[PDB]
Design an enzyme around this catalytic site. Structure first.
Site, PDB file in Angstrom:
ATOM      1  N   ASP A  75       0.870  -1.167   0.000  1.00 33.54           N
ATOM      2  CA  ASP A  75       0.000   0.000   0.000  1.00 33.54           C
ATOM      3  C   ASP A  75       0.911   1.222   0.000  1.00 33.54           C
ATOM      4  O   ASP A  75       1.510   1.563   1.021  1.00 33.54           O
ATOM      5  CB  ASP A  75      -0.897   0.008   1.240  1.00 33.54           C
ATOM      6  CG  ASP A  75      -1.737   1.269   1.342  1.00 33.54           C
ATOM      7  OD1 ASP A  75      -2.452   1.596   0.372  1.00 33.54           O
ATOM      8  OD2 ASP A  75      -1.683   1.935   2.397  1.00 33.54           O
ATOM      9  N   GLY A  91      -4.615   3.358   0.162  1.00 31.07           N
ATOM     10  CA  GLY A  91      -5.204   2.283  -0.616  1.00 31.07           C
ATOM     11  C   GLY A  91      -4.691   2.112  -2.032  1.00 31.07           C
ATOM     12  O   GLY A  91      -5.359   1.498  -2.866  1.00 31.07           O
ATOM     13  N   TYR A 108      12.839  32.046 -28.389  1.00 33.64           N
ATOM     14  CA  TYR A 108      13.520  31.430 -29.517  1.00 33.64           C
ATOM     15  C   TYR A 108      12.812  30.140 -29.927  1.00 33.64           C
ATOM     16  O   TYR A 108      12.091  29.532 -29.134  1.00 33.64           O
ATOM     17  CB  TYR A 108      14.977  31.104 -29.157  1.00 33.64           C
ATOM     18  CG  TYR A 108      15.133  30.229 -27.930  1.00 33.64           C
ATOM     19  CD1 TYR A 108      15.298  30.791 -26.667  1.00 33.64           C
ATOM     20  CD2 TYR A 108      15.085  28.834 -28.027  1.00 33.64           C
ATOM     21  CE1 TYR A 108      15.409  29.995 -25.528  1.00 33.64           C
ATOM     22  CE2 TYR A 108      15.193  28.027 -26.892  1.00 33.64           C
ATOM     23  CZ  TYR A 108      15.356  28.616 -25.647  1.00 33.64           C
ATOM     24  OH  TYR A 108      15.464  27.837 -24.517  1.00 33.64           O
ATOM     25  N   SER A 110      15.623  22.077 -17.463  1.00 35.18           N
ATOM     26  CA  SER A 110      15.357  23.504 -17.608  1.00 35.18           C
ATOM     27  C   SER A 110      15.604  23.991 -19.032  1.00 35.18           C
ATOM     28  O   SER A 110      15.295  25.134 -19.365  1.00 35.18           O
ATOM     29  CB  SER A 110      16.210  24.311 -16.626  1.00 35.18           C
ATOM     30  OG  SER A 110      17.591  24.191 -16.900  1.00 35.18           O
ATOM     31  N   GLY A 111      16.162  23.127 -19.875  1.00 34.20           N
ATOM     32  CA  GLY A 111      16.398  23.519 -21.252  1.00 34.20           C
ATOM     33  C   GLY A 111      17.826  23.798 -21.676  1.00 34.20           C
ATOM     34  O   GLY A 111      18.049  24.386 -22.729  1.00 34.20           O
ATOM     35  N   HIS A 132      25.233  21.941 -27.831  1.00 31.87           N
ATOM     36  CA  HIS A 132      24.855  21.689 -29.210  1.00 31.87           C
ATOM     37  C   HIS A 132      25.663  22.444 -30.245  1.00 31.87           C
ATOM     38  O   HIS A 132      26.430  23.354 -29.924  1.00 31.87           O
ATOM     39  CB  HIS A 132      23.378  22.015 -29.402  1.00 31.87           C
ATOM     40  CG  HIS A 132      23.069  23.475 -29.268  1.00 31.87           C
ATOM     41  ND1 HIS A 132      23.335  24.385 -30.270  1.00 31.87           N
ATOM     42  CD2 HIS A 132      22.573  24.192 -28.232  1.00 31.87           C
ATOM     43  CE1 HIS A 132      23.016  25.599 -29.858  1.00 31.87           C
ATOM     44  NE2 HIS A 132      22.549  25.511 -28.624  1.00 31.87           N
ATOM     45  N   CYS A 143      22.226  27.792 -23.287  1.00 37.54           N
ATOM     46  CA  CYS A 143      22.871  26.582 -23.796  1.00 37.54           C
ATOM     47  C   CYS A 143      24.369  26.745 -23.951  1.00 37.54           C
ATOM     48  O   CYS A 143      24.870  27.867 -24.023  1.00 37.54           O
ATOM     49  CB  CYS A 143      22.296  26.197 -25.157  1.00 37.54           C
ATOM     50  SG  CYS A 143      20.659  25.515 -25.040  1.00 37.54           S
TER      51      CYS A 143
END
Length: 261
Positions: free
Chosen positions: A85, A89, A171, A184-185, A189, A207
């Site tokens: 449990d 429940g 963006y 958070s992004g 890259h 980034c």
């Protein structure tokens, strides 16, 4: 269902992950009794190492050691909620298990003082990439980031993170070789548009912009669980409950847990 909840475990069964990968158990329903859930979860490690549970929200709990995993460690997870449990429940719809292993120690450090992202494998520098992080008005947070998913090509849309695309900090950007390091992004890259600024000036929305060649290398050699640590930026610190910011929570606080919450 209704009184039944199904647990999901990460990482994948048989997966090889980095030294910062936490064990994650996600329920499809909020857990009324966090204590019960933690008791039903059995984790075995070899070499053996102490670890503790900490909840990121009402449906997901994380388990990790005080320090990063030692490479080669084998981890077995048993989520035995059937007949348990989990609060008010609610019982486990079934039991789940997963086994994963820890690969080499990969830690990439991005120092805002040098504007360089240095990748170290087992302590040895293998790559030094000029980078351009968040500009002063939209800075990259300092902290320890755990590598997540990777995409050969994807669009990063600011509205996913509560910022309208039509607003000043908005963006909707197509990017190649993207490796996500925060819910958070924040991603590492390919940024052909900031190659000039890379290694000199921060121009992004947060980034870690690197060269196409370096981003592709990052995409090919870095895996889920590896670590990216950002230091010396004008930003704050990645939240411990980000989803990939687990390590930013002090051990004493993490060990203490938050089950009675």
């Amino acid at each position: 269902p209704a009184h039944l909840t199904m647990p999901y475990v990460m990482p994948g069964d048989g997966e090889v992950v980095g030294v910062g990968e936490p064990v994650a158990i996600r329920f499809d329903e909020n857990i009324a009794d966090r204590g019960a859930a933690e008791k039903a979860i059995k984790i075995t490690t070899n070499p053996p190492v102490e670890g503790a549970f900490y909840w990121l929200n009402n449906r997901e709990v994380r388990w990790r050691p005080e320090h990063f995993w030692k490479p080669g460690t084998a981890v077995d997870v048993a989520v035995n909620t059937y007949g348990v449990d989990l609060g008010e429940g609610m019982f486990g719809e079934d039991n789940v298990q997963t086994h994963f292993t820890i690969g080499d120690e990969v830690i990439a450090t991005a120092d805002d003082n040098t504007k360089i992202l240095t990748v170290r494998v087992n302590g040895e520098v293998v790559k030094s990439m000029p980078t351009s992080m968040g500009k002063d008005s939209t800075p990259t947070a300092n902290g320890i980031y755990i590598v997540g998913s990777r995409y050969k090509h994807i669009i990063m849309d600011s509205s996913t993170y509560g910022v309208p695309v039509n607003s000043p900090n908005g963006y909707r950007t197509d990017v190649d070789w993207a490796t996500q390091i925060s819910y958070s992004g924040v991603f590492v890259h390919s940024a052909p548009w900031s190659v000039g600024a890379q290694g000199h000036t921060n121009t992004s929305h947060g980034c870690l912009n690197v060269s196409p060649s370096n981003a592709q290398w990052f995409y090919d050699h870095v895996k889920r669980g590896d670590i990216v640590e950002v230091v010396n930026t004008v930003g704050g610190t990645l939240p411990g409950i980000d989803g990939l910011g687990d390590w930013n929570i002090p051990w004493d606080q993490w060990r203490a847990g938050n089950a009675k919450a």
